[PDB]
Enzyme design. Sequence first.
Site, PDB file in Angstrom:
ATOM      1  N   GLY A  41       0.809  -1.208   0.000  1.00 11.41           N
ATOM      2  CA  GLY A  41       0.000   0.000   0.000  1.00 11.41           C
ATOM      3  C   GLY A  41       0.844   1.260   0.000  1.00 11.41           C
ATOM      4  O   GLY A  41       0.482   2.261  -0.624  1.00 11.41           O
ATOM      5  N   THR A  42       1.981   1.227   0.697  1.00 12.36           N
ATOM      6  CA  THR A  42       2.892   2.367   0.704  1.00 12.36           C
ATOM      7  C   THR A  42       3.719   2.417  -0.575  1.00 12.36           C
ATOM      8  O   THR A  42       3.782   3.456  -1.243  1.00 12.36           O
ATOM      9  CB  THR A  42       3.802   2.294   1.932  1.00 12.36           C
TER      10      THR A  42
ATOM     11  N   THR B 169       2.169 -10.941  -0.106  1.00 11.36           N
ATOM     12  CA  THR B 169       1.508 -10.759   1.177  1.00 11.36           C
ATOM     13  C   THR B 169       0.072 -10.264   1.059  1.00 11.36           C
ATOM     14  O   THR B 169      -0.592 -10.099   2.087  1.00 11.36           O
ATOM     15  CB  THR B 169       2.305  -9.776   2.044  1.00 11.36           C
TER      16      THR B 169
ATOM     17  N   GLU C 193      -2.721  -7.161  -4.567  1.00 10.25           N
ATOM     18  CA  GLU C 193      -1.542  -6.598  -5.216  1.00 10.25           C
ATOM     19  C   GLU C 193      -1.733  -6.292  -6.704  1.00 10.25           C
ATOM     20  O   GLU C 193      -1.154  -5.292  -7.164  1.00 10.25           O
ATOM     21  CB  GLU C 193      -0.332  -7.519  -4.974  1.00 10.25           C
TER      22      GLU C 193
ATOM     23  N   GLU D 201      21.155   9.854 -19.653  1.00 11.61           N
ATOM     24  CA  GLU D 201      21.686   8.891 -20.612  1.00 11.61           C
ATOM     25  C   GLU D 201      20.918   7.576 -20.578  1.00 11.61           C
ATOM     26  O   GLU D 201      20.779   6.921 -21.618  1.00 11.61           O
ATOM     27  CB  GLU D 201      23.176   8.651 -20.364  1.00 11.61           C
TER      28      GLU D 201
HETATM   29  N1  GTP Z   1      12.227  -8.559  -3.233  1.00  9.80           N
HETATM   30  C1  GTP Z   1      11.610  -8.122  -2.138  1.00  9.80           C
HETATM   31  N2  GTP Z   1      10.240  -7.972  -2.134  1.00  9.80           N
HETATM   32  C2  GTP Z   1       9.610  -7.531  -1.018  1.00  9.80           C
HETATM   33  C3  GTP Z   1      10.323  -7.227   0.130  1.00  9.80           C
HETATM   34  N3  GTP Z   1       9.442  -6.814   1.073  1.00  9.80           N
HETATM   35  C4  GTP Z   1       8.196  -6.851   0.544  1.00  9.80           C
HETATM   36  N4  GTP Z   1       8.289  -7.308  -0.748  1.00  9.80           N
HETATM   37  C5  GTP Z   1       7.189  -7.484  -1.707  1.00  9.80           C
HETATM   38  O1  GTP Z   1       6.418  -6.297  -1.680  1.00  9.80           O
HETATM   39  C6  GTP Z   1       5.034  -6.602  -1.698  1.00  9.80           C
HETATM   40  C7  GTP Z   1       4.412  -6.089  -0.405  1.00  9.80           C
HETATM   41  O2  GTP Z   1       4.668  -4.704  -0.304  1.00  9.80           O
HETATM   42  P1  GTP Z   1       5.498  -4.051   0.901  1.00  9.80           P
HETATM   43  O3  GTP Z   1       6.690  -3.259   0.410  1.00  9.80           O
HETATM   44  O4  GTP Z   1       5.913  -5.101   1.897  1.00  9.80           O
HETATM   45  O5  GTP Z   1       4.388  -3.094   1.582  1.00  9.80           O
HETATM   46  P2  GTP Z   1       4.606  -1.536   1.906  1.00  9.80           P
HETATM   47  O6  GTP Z   1       5.234  -0.785   0.749  1.00  9.80           O
HETATM   48  O7  GTP Z   1       5.430  -1.375   3.150  1.00  9.80           O
HETATM   49  O8  GTP Z   1       3.101  -0.983   2.083  1.00  9.80           O
HETATM   50  P3  GTP Z   1       2.172  -1.259   3.375  1.00  9.80           P
HETATM   51  O9  GTP Z   1       2.821  -2.238   4.315  1.00  9.80           O
HETATM   52  O10 GTP Z   1       0.858  -1.771   2.859  1.00  9.80           O
HETATM   53  O11 GTP Z   1       1.995   0.067   4.067  1.00  9.80           O
HETATM   54  C8  GTP Z   1       4.911  -8.111  -1.795  1.00  9.80           C
HETATM   55  O12 GTP Z   1       4.751  -8.469  -3.150  1.00  9.80           O
HETATM   56  C9  GTP Z   1       6.247  -8.605  -1.295  1.00  9.80           C
HETATM   57  O13 GTP Z   1       6.574  -9.845  -1.875  1.00  9.80           O
HETATM   58  C10 GTP Z   1      11.704  -7.373   0.129  1.00  9.80           C
HETATM   59  O14 GTP Z   1      12.364  -7.104   1.131  1.00  9.80           O
HETATM   60  N5  GTP Z   1      12.339  -7.822  -1.011  1.00  9.80           N
END
Ligand code: GTP
Lengths: 426, 319, 54, 441
Positions: free
Chosen positions: D144-145, D179, D183, D254
């Site tokens: 969400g973020t 998660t 998505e 570039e």
């Molecule tokens: N490659 C990778 N993917 C990640 C990681 N953390 C979360 N994800 C992916 O990011 C998606 C979830 O979004 P997040 O970044 O965890 O959520 P957020 O941006 O913090 O937003 P909210 O928690 O809803 O406020 C999922 O598809 C996860 O698989 C990470 O550390 N590495």
Amino acid sequence: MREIVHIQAGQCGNQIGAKFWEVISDEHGIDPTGSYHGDSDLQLERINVYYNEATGNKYVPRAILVDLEPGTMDSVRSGPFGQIFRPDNFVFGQSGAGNNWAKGHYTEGAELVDSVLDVVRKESESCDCLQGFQLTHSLGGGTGSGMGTLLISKIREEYPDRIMNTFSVMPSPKVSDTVVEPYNATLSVHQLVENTDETYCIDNEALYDICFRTLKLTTPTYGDLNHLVSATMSGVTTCLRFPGQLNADLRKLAVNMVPFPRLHFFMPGFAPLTSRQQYRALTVPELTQQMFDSKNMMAACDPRHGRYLTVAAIFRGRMSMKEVDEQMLNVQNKNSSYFVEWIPNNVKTAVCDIPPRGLKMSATFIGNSTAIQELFKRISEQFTAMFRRKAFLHWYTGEGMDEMEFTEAESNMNDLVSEYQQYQDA
Amino acid sequence: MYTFVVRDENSSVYAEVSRLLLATGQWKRLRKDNPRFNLMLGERNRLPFGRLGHEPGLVQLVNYYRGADKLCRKASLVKLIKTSPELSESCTWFPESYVIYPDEREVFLAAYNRRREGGNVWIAKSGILISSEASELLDFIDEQVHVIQKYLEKPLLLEPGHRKFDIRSWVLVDHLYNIYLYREGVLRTSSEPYCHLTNHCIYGRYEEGNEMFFEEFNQYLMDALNTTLENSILLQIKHIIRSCLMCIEPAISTKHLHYQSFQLFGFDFMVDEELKVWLIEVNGAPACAQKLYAELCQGIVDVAISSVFPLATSIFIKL
Amino acid sequence: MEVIELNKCTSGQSFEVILKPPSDPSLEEIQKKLEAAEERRKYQEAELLKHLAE
Amino acid sequence: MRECISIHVGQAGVQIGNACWELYCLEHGIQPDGQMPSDKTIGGGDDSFNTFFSETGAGKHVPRAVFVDLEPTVIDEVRTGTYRQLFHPEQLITGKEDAANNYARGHYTIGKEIIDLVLDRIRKLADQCTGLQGFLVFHSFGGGTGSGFTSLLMERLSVDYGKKSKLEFSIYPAPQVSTAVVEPYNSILTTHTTLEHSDCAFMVDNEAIYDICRRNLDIERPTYTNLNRLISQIVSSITASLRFDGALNVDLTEFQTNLVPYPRIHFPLATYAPVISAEKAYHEQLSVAEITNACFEPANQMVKCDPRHGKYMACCLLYRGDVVPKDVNAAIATIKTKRSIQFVDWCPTGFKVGINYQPPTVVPGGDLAKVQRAVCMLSNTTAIAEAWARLDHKFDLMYAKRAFVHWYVGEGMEEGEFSEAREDMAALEKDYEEVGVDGEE
Ligand SMILES: Nc1nc2c(ncn2[C@@H]2O[C@H](COP(=O)(O)OP(=O)(O)OP(=O)(O)O)[C@@H](O)[C@H]2O)c(=O)[nH]1
Ligand SMILES: C=C(CC(=O)OC)C(=O)N[C@@H](c1ccccc1)[C@@H](O)C(=O)O[C@H]1C[C@@]2(O)[C@@H](OC(=O)c3ccccc3)[C@@H]3[C@]4(OC(C)=O)CO[C@@H]4C[C@H](O)[C@@]3(C)C(=O)[C@H](O)C(=C1C)C2(C)C
Ligand SMILES: Nc1ncnc2c1ncn2[C@@H]1O[C@H](COP(=O)(O)OP(=O)(O)CP(=O)(O)O)[C@@H](O)[C@H]1O
Ligand SMILES: Nc1nc2c(ncn2[C@@H]2O[C@H](COP(=O)(O)OP(=O)(O)O)[C@@H](O)[C@H]2O)c(=O)[nH]1
Ligand SMILES: [Ca+2]
Ligand SMILES: [Mg+2]
Ligand SMILES: [Mg+2]
Ligand SMILES: [Mg+2]
């Protein structure tokens, strides 16, 4: 710091609530005096969610105990972990509710509700970032059903942007105290449709059948039923209490589990469940197959009579994460007919390393299935069998209710049943 | 248990394959839009290859090679042969052809005039017209991209009847790109004296349904021409099949891909009076002869499907 | 095939190889959108509190 | 010298940024306390590494980075991690309650209350730049973020830094480590709103990284730590030209000039080789030809797709280690004869090559083996549209039933934004089709 405020109301609510706090206190290393004595930092990492930290490094449950008669809460206070609760958080009257929703919701309950809101406000003000509330109660009585839903409505009025979650025990004529239980449950279900975000539907018919047929308990007691519920409640809250990525808070859980606002009634399940064999090691395939079997689910609904909108599965203990995925995708691909096609990847799996006290491996199931309509259909049938003849209505009209309120509650739950059938055919 | 979906209700070959899978007790058919399948019997047009191989925990197989259309469309087949060095424009088993849009219009005329200056009957297709002079061939195409191909004026004619024919060969290419030639072919024979078109759509005089199978045709070649089907014809057929499929293998192979492909092809051949074999076209979604349905479809399940999804003498010739 | 634009330094080098030649919303607009969504949230909450007052 | 500011949004962006800056410090010889014994110009300088690091009078080299997340637990690990001394508190921004995997909550409800603080902190870094060229934005599609707040931030950055370039590193959702069920919604919503504000975006499909870790590193169940160390190697390869001396991709503009001929089609496909496990005592070292050939294997791409069925618009080869131009050309000539490499007719059929002599650095105790030469290929191929088609189809399945839509409308969003975003994606799919595409028988 995302705190949850817990409320338990009425006889069933306080008895199941007391057992829930006993179970998770042991998991987090908290003794009946509130002192931590565990051996793992994972026990304390998210302990703030359910416990406040008082003077002297003591942990006090963020729990409020409500009843319209003192009996059950006297037995809680004199129980095993009775001294762990904050004494000011016991809010009780003396008149009782007489298994009467109107007394809990409109007369006896209305006299006491402001005092409960005072304690809710006190706990909420001491929260760094309150995420929401969890309520334990039955729907078949008067206090948990009538006053419990009154509390939910008033809490929503004062905290409209917080999550409301309930563990709601649904009545069954097989495990019944009074004939008016379908009336109380039908009036309560409409309140839950409007004012909760997630409701775990715990059917006393399913708990009894599990104790009798699976656990080989010839004469199950309410204590036996509450033992199943406390183990289930610990399982479904594991994601809230221990570090994890999936459904880590009430709102993310709701966004993952509730595709339409009124269809938020979940069927919980637990594995293992076996007769006393007991020391026998359990394998991942056996956990997965049991956790998805109807015999292990606590809403007395056959999931093959409907379809899964969303599913959350939580595995506890040391096990192969690769193996967990294989069996989880195995049951998913082999029985794809029972998962709706228009919600891709609707089964989510979490794993927590810390298992419950007596087991090396366990699994908890949370399903949002359209087959839950069978539960609401049963209540509606029992409601109508009496309401057609206005039977036992004088208990409610004597408290000021009119027959129109019963008619409206009947129409509301039949509408809920129709909504589930819409998506079951989709 | 294995799961599959059906996306082409009009395929007789795979309507049979699906009922054989539904007779092993180990295959389950899902709704056509369920993404959790092992095997897709896909649609003929616009198969969503980009959505395959993205289901966690599922080995996915589809009955079409993405990119095989280059071989199975007439215009692109001509361009493939003339532009692929593995085949060259000096290719000896493919009739002289030109891609012209209603462009190779000028090169067609230079080749046409040079042999009219010194027989030059050609054919149009993409709806068929055979003319002896070029001005008439071009006016018909302006009435979609077409190709003009040299018409075989000296075909091998069966006796009695003095009748034209063509040979259909079924070829199965599995996920490992093994090339399997079904041991049974069919001769779609004309029933009129040389009658220029032998398509089974266009009766029953010398053989049932204008279909002669290899056993009778080989017996004929021995009696009338003192040779065999294997020597005079099938060696060239195997050579052409290998040349075409090996040419496109780098483009369509799914060896290191996140999903796997197999496909059944229909090769169409003609034979001239000197017992030389010419490739006519390749069909990517062919039907089968009514007798050979049971054997070939079972062979598809054995070679293409059960090889990837094991259950609880080969009819093919491996090229 | 041809190499062009060869540039070299002590930490590496770079070049190009050719095989064949060819043949916004303003701040106030963003603000209006954010405030319009905020008003819709306030209206939905106002309706809820009116429903609860009833 | 022109500075680059990195912005890490949400859990994925923050944790990947943590991995990248750890790797940057090892590549440049910067210790966890910020000291750099090779920088003989104490308290300043305009070297190539100064594009990513400022300098204090005490000799500390401070990343030009901002970390933002709507809940504090992920950024708290940056505050207490190994490289905690690298950052000052103003670079780390946290809220108290996250966007709950809800684009509308991250973009509208919560984003409106924190955007001004984030911009103030970014402005503080920008004021320290003598010639800021732009931003590198790290975020997930699915959170969400990462979805909701990033798109809001990108809009405001276009207003406040109109002339600056903006590049993205975007995590495309994969159910194997995902998660949230919603998505696909968040991905389409953020791509629609961010499309006009990003000059070049490198998508990384978690499914591809997961499978590479399983196949090449023999990791049975990869964690985010496993995934992020691999991702940071690819990010480092892409940004190395900005941090080291060189002539190719030396400024953010570039990247657009070399990789993006049309503004909307700005998603290059990254392919990286070799990925080799640390646990094995002796690997055979792959030559220039072998690692270059591996760039055309779908199993090594950051997004699984088939470039044989698309067309190329640009192709860059970024080598690190023991590589000389003679061997690159010999490798390219061999590959072109044996591979399906077709460019659009209005673009030259060629490769822009960069070589950095330093071999790729690996984290001690990591899973990647130290190799003698590596390569990251950046190609802009229409085949990456397969990833959009997959996402748009999952969107269509849920939206036809309006599943979960009430969560977004509840935060002030309108249903019209769903269809407006989806129509933009349909036009994007159409754009890729135009650029790259030529029964019972
Ligand atoms: N490659 C990778 N993917 C990640 C990681 N953390 C979360 N994800 C992916 O990011 C998606 C979830 O979004 P997040 O970044 O965890 O959520 P957020 O941006 O913090 O937003 P909210 O928690 O809803 O406020 C999922 O598809 C996860 O698989 C990470 O550390 N590495
Ligand atoms: C604190 C308590 C209460 C308690 O019991 O303390 C007095 C507790 O229950 N915690 C546990 C827990 C579980 C999940 C989540 C959180 C906590 C756990 O860690 C534990 O201790 O389980 C207990 C529970 C058992 O009674 C028993 O169940 C029952 O007969 C029973 C009767 C009525 C209702 C429910 C059960 C139990 C079962 O139930 C369970 C739960 O496993 C049933 O099928 C499960 C398989 C178990 O092998 C089998 C058969 C046992 O034989 C085992 O030897 C044993 C354990 C491992 C007990 C005999 C003591
Ligand atoms: N160059 C050529 N010389 C002689 N005959 C030819 C020819 N090209 C086509 N034909 C004749 O045309 C008939 C088939 O034409 P073609 O195969 O192009 O049509 P089609 O594709 O619609 C039928 P199918 O799908 O079964 O292959 C054959 O019987 C063959 O005799
Ligand atoms: N599972 C369980 N159900 C209970 C328990 N006590 C009561 N019930 C059920 O709750 C309903 C009666 O409500 P109760 O909680 O006793 O009334 P209240 O005190 O007015 O809220 C009936 O359906 C009972 O079967 C209990 O301890 N466990
Ligand atoms: Ca310096
Ligand atoms: Mg009672
Ligand atoms: Mg987050
Ligand atoms: Mg044909």
